[PDB]
């Protein structure tokens, strides 16, 4: 049942990569403003990032769902 563990690894990597961009840009903004109301700037940044990457998130998630459907087509 190596496909099960492969799917688990895929899910973990997908979660990590999806959380990488917005959390990373929020951290960058926070450290940049701390090096010299941080929450307002952080929220503006994360909102802009979500607005920009919304389509990419959607298409990647739909591709993953199609892959899962293909797997359960005859599994």
């Amino acid at each position: 049942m190596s496909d099960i563990v492969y799917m688990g690894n895929k899910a973990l990597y997908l979660i990590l990569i999806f959380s990488l961009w917005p959390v990373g840009i929020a951290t960058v903004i926070g450290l940049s403003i701390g090096l010299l109301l941080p929450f307002g700037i952080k929220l503006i940044g994360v909102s802009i990032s979500l607005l920009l990457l919304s389509g990419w998130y959607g298409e990647v998630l739909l591709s993953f769902c199609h892959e899962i459907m293909f797997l359960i087509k005859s599994g």
Binding site: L52, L53, G55, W56, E59
Partner: peptide, 17 residues
């Protein structure tokens, strides 16, 4: 159409191809 961009919607990729 651009080749280097932050976002690559599926329409953009299909248009490139």
């Amino acid at each position: 159409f651009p080749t280097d961009s932050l976002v690559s919607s599926p329409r953009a990729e299909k248009a490139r191809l």
